[PDB]
């Protein structure tokens, strides 16, 4: 299919915009080319069941959570978007795990990525839950859907999260404020950034990806 050859070439162009030594961020000056590329792939009939290259999921995660910053990073806590982001993050982790199974020690790097991944994922789910609990009235249907898909299926945690959605708004807000202070977003920003950088390094060093990590691998 020539449409498939065109789509693959659009993917190669996005690679040169998306792959960074550090974290991707959209520049106003690149917005038209990047957007035109994404839209072309998004409506390309031959890409509907193609696998998303991992560099695209990584760029999405860096853009979605604004990993280029370290301040309020203008994260859009919307249920549908954050649910897609978690699925994307899981695809990344899935692919990182396969890389490890086929200068750096594998056992150490895999363990570090797994710990960062698990912390980052729990932080994202909790802050999505916080956003749900801070609205009045609560969107209980999507709140519940989100907790089944992504809330760690522990007895007494989902026990309590669903009781708390039934507290009144002033109490929900006091409780959410306390837990946000106990666990600020800046910690999960750092963990998630380090997860992405750890993953980029492992993929380049141990498999045939290029994530422009040459200047980091060398200092080992």
């Amino acid at each position: 299919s020539n449409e498939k050859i065109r789509s693959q070439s659009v993917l190669n162009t996005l690679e040169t915009f998306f792959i960074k030594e550090n974290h991707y961020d959209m520049q106003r000056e690149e917005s038209s080319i990047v957007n035109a590329c994404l839209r072309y792939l998004g409506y390309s009939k031959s890409m509907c069941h193609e696998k998303m290259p991992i560099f695209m999921d990584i760029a999405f995660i860096e853009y979605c959570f604004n990993l280029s910053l370290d301040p309020s990073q203008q994260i859009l806590w919307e249920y549908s978007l954050i649910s897609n982001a978690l699925e994307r993050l899981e695809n990344i982790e899935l692919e990182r795990q396969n890389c490890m199974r086929e200068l750096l020690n594998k056992e150490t790097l895999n363990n570090e990525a797994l710990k960062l991944y698990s912390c980052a994922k729990a932080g994202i789910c909790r802050w999505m839950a916080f956003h749900f609990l801070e609205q009045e009235p609560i969107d209980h249907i999507n709140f519940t859907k989100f907790l089944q898909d992504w809330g760690s299926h522990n007895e007494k945690e989902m026990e309590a999260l669903q009781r708390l959605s039934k507290h009144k708004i002033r109490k929900r807000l006091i409780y959410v404020s306390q837990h946000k202070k106990k666990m600020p977003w800046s910690k999960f920003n750092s963990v998630l950034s380090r997860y992405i950088q750890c993953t980029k390094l492992q993929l380049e060093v141990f498999c045939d990806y290029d994530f422009k990590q040459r200047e980091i691998v060398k200092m080992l």
Binding site: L38, G42, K45, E50, M52, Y63
Partner: peptide, 29 residues
């Protein structure tokens, strides 16, 4: 055997990424 394919409608990971990307950009402006 895909209905959205037979209907010619946008779907799949690239379409979902496109819409999510637009939501983020719009929000940040």
């Amino acid at each position: 055997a895909c209905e959205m394919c037979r209907l010619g409608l946008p779907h799949g990971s690239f379409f979902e990424l496109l819409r999510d990307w637009k939501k983020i950009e719009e929000f940040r402006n």
